[PDB]
Enzyme design. Sequence first.
Site, PDB file in Angstrom:
ATOM      1  N   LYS A   1      48.945  38.134  24.789  1.00  0.00           N
ATOM      2  CA  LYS A   1      50.267  38.623  25.098  1.00  0.00           C
ATOM      3  C   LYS A   1      51.332  37.751  24.419  1.00  0.00           C
ATOM      4  O   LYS A   1      51.410  36.545  24.700  1.00  0.00           O
ATOM      5  CB  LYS A   1      50.478  38.534  26.614  1.00  0.00           C
ATOM      6  CG  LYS A   1      51.879  38.984  27.039  1.00  0.00           C
ATOM      7  CD  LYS A   1      52.123  38.627  28.482  1.00  0.00           C
ATOM      8  CE  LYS A   1      53.571  38.871  28.773  1.00  0.00           C
ATOM      9  NZ  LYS A   1      53.906  38.254  30.077  1.00  0.00           N
TER      10      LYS A   1
ATOM     11  N   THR B   1      50.138  35.710  47.705  1.00  0.00           N
ATOM     12  CA  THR B   1      50.991  36.743  48.291  1.00  0.00           C
ATOM     13  C   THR B   1      51.184  36.564  49.823  1.00  0.00           C
ATOM     14  O   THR B   1      52.037  37.231  50.426  1.00  0.00           O
ATOM     15  CB  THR B   1      50.468  38.177  47.965  1.00  0.00           C
ATOM     16  OG1 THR B   1      49.159  38.298  48.488  1.00  0.00           O
ATOM     17  CG2 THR B   1      50.452  38.461  46.439  1.00  0.00           C
TER      18      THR B   1
END
EC number: 1.14.19.9
Lengths: 527, 527
Positions: free
Chosen positions: B78, B347
């Site tokens: 990326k 999370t």
Amino acid sequence: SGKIDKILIVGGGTAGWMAASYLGKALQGTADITLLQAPDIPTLGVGEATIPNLQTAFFDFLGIPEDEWMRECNASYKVAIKFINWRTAGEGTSEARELDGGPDHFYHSFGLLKYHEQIPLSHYWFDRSYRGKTVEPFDYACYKEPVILDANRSPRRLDGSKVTNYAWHFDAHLVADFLRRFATEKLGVRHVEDRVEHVQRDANGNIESVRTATGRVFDADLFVDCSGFRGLLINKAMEEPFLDMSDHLLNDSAVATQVPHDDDANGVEPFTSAIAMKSGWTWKIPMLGRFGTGYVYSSRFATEDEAVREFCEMWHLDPETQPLNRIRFRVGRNRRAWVGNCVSIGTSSCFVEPLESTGIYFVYAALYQLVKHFPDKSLNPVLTARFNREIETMFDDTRDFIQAHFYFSPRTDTPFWRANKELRLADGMQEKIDMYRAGMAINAPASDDAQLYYGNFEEEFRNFWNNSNYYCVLAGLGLVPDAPSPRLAHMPQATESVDEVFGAVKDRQRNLLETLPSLHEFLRQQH
Amino acid sequence: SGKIDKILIVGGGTAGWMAASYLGKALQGTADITLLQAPDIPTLGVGEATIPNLQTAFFDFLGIPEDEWMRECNASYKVAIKFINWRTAGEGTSEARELDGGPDHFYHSFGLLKYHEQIPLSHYWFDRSYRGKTVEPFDYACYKEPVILDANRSPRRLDGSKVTNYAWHFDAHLVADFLRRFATEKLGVRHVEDRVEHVQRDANGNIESVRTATGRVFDADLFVDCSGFRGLLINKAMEEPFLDMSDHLLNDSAVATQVPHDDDANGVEPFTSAIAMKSGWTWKIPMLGRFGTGYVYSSRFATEDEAVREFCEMWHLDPETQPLNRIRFRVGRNRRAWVGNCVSIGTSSCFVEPLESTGIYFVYAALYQLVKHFPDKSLNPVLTARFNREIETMFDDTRDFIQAHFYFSPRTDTPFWRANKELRLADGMQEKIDMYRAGMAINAPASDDAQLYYGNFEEEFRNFWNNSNYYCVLAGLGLVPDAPSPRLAHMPQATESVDEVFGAVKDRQRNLLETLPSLHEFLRQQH
Ligand SMILES: Cc1cc2nc3c(=O)[nH]c(=O)nc-3n(C[C@H](O)[C@H](O)[C@H](O)COP(=O)(O)OP(=O)(O)OC[C@H]3O[C@@H](n4cnc5c(N)ncnc54)[C@H](O)[C@@H]3O)c2cc1C
Ligand SMILES: Nc1ncnc2c1ncn2[C@@H]1O[C@H](CO)[C@@H](O)[C@H]1O
Ligand SMILES: N[C@@H](Cc1c[nH]c2ccccc12)C(=O)O
Ligand SMILES: N[C@@H](Cc1c[nH]c2ccccc12)C(=O)O
Ligand SMILES: [Cl-]
């Protein structure tokens, strides 16, 4: 709109001539700059101490090599502040008292503590100290400098090579003169010698013009107040309140002089001394064949007469005969440094006792910020507000650091030293102390590479008082964490291999003590 | 009360095995670590995008070469996020619409803008743009990357040499599994497969032990909550409030899948795509022979059924039979990440939509911060408070940045795009926008050296969203300053000489476009 075309600087002296030089350089050929200053009674040269970014942030910006200015200003070298008698009771004396088998002194040196396995050297020192593995003071353990400074060594070898981070001692009158000549002869700054009598403001409350005693009128787009503690423009004309901060700093006064010195008999000390007194502290700033000295004291704890006597007694001066400057300071900062089209620079803006050599720094740090937040004639309110925030932080962080020198002194022997323990630390400072006591670094530098730090103003401004500085002062005074960093108990390999880092410092202490010329020898060659 | 002896991590997946690996490494041989995890219904691998400090702050810390982990996890490269259709009205489509003569896309690339005479290149670009000297977009003017990303070029030459900053695309499950093997096999982490049934707290509110469904009781000194959105320990046991941030972020849901891809016919894109939709945006994360893709949407503006249709129609999938993950997110953060002896990681701590690839970063950032603030058994409250402060800021600054992608989109075509303009920016974000409109840098990097930045976690963490990132996104969307930096009119030599800086970008664009292999050609060799 339109760009700023005309700038008027009110006030000569160090702040004004730095503003003239810095703005003259930064805006060269795109702004007309006049400096206006009243010839007035000059003072004794009591000496100024500085920090390394003077060369990198200021003289390098002007394009002026260190050699050129330092010879013009008869400068000497500073490698540290030597804090004397801050832990022991008694009278103001130039000689360190005995504490725990050695002299009552500690150093705050330039540079950065080495990181070992991501952790500052200070933490490993403290772990060793707490567990009784060392009785060595923090400064001698972690810095090569204290051993060489004890022997009055030069920071440069005779061949010119630098062995440590250093800054300068000089008479600020000489630097102001030097910069006047530079701004006027090389940058086209107009110099007017006249006294401001009247400041005319417009309906927006911005400065329109200044009229002098001779009736001359000067207009500008931007006015830079370098008028000193008077704040002729920022306080008097613009009516911006000054914020006194004597709830953090008791010292508000000084008695200061210059003392002749035999450098041949005694050598020259590569450090400023900060000598604790009954009701304040005394600076000693060695220059060439003279030292500048001043007793900084609290008018609430000593009268002017007591301070004059205490100060003369310590240096064996005759109070009837010695030339003395007696000074009462404004301590704190303006509510806002820049209001409308008026920017304050120097002591018109803020002031704190010179305990950590920040006075001149505050001038070129502010000038750097002014140029970064430079307006056009629309005077964007965001540029002003951001500049004001940078100044208020720059100053308040320093005010806090300095309060901590008094607050954590162990002395209880005079009304002054006891009264310091009864002030409150600012919230931000209490938080740093809480972190320090929990074994945390306070503002650890992002890298331990001193060249990155002192070579990049933006990097240093963001991390101005760093973990090294807090440890020098707090651990020097005897404030240490409640217990070692809990991390270190989980890093047996790191606490083992750190021994080589301490050995490496010991090696440099030994080899530099043996190989370095005295500062006096180097200065003779240099000048 | 002594050092932490035992750590219990509750939850596997990526966060739990990162925690296990990082703590196992940081505290190797001085703490017993157990990870407790129940086997759950596994999900399709819908892809994860990362940022360059994954290698330098995470895998380099663990001692794992990039080649090793990436080949095990079938990773791709990326170079940027490509934002598609954020400025133009219409349906959710994988094809960029036309805007001003070219496709509606801009890039958020890695790296830092070059400084020219102390000023970021962004400011010179905008000066030229504003005065009509250029119509070139910011990203194409200031970064070499857009040109080579348009041609799907590799960030590495076939000889292995790196020409740009890059990060990774991968199936997070493969990384979790790689890390489970590493932590259990190399670091002596105990893995227990069991389901927490009961959390026992003491009268100080600390966790004493957890009891599982088999009746096994696991005590520890420190509990790491990696249970995901459930917050088994931090929320359910410790009762810590969760702060919903839907006054800043409307997106709370996703529908996601994985699509096979013929890389031989089509090549592989060296970028994550973020594709604007009617009621959110869709990620595309190229991996090897497949892409992960997910529509992040606001349940306030689309039903699950609607989002399913829009998403499947975009990719030409049968909504009735395509394998889909339907996810409702918990968006925001805990009031405090660490409470008593319970630290949330992953999370269970905080979540924001993956628009800027921060999810994995939030795990190892928090783990770095945990080791930095590591307690002993006395749980010094200053360590906990300071850790919590670093987590609040890491999350809130990301929340603000992400909100700005929607708030400053020019789109008004659906209820969703319009509703985003009716939300308020947080105060700290509005201040950044005020600065930006005034022509100031927002969080300018201290240095434009990307190696120092990506190679030093402290440096990066203190300056995580920097001026480069703000300009890519704000200027990409079309928010530009009201006027050029007023400074630049005083710098005619610098605004002349910056042409060589733009010309050098253009040369690198041309030379790399001509000499680089495709991403796909490099991957064939690499894997
Ligand atoms: C006790 C003392 C010790 C210090 N020690 C250190 C140190 O060790 N290290 C360090 O870095 N810094 C130190 N400093 C700080 C530093 O000296 C100052 O910032 C700087 O050198 C001088 O301040 P200034 O130029 O702002 O003000 P001033 O020197 O007071 O200059 C004021 C100027 O304004 C002009 N002016 C005022 N009113 C009018 C008017 N009506 N019309 C025309 N002109 C006017 C005056 O004529 C003069 O030119 C010290 C300061 C003091 C007070
Ligand atoms: N009750 C539970 N017991 C053990 N692990 C759990 C429990 N709830 C969630 N987890 C872990 O949290 C992760 C969810 O992201 C999974 O590893 C899951 O097993
Ligand atoms: N960042 C400054 C801190 C400082 C100010 N005054 C000092 C005096 C001595 C040592 C350090 C300082 C420096 O290292 O230069
Ligand atoms: N400091 C981060 C900022 C960042 C987060 N997500 C990004 C996506 C693309 C480009 C930059 C980023 C980096 O340069 O890695
Ligand atoms: Cl000073």
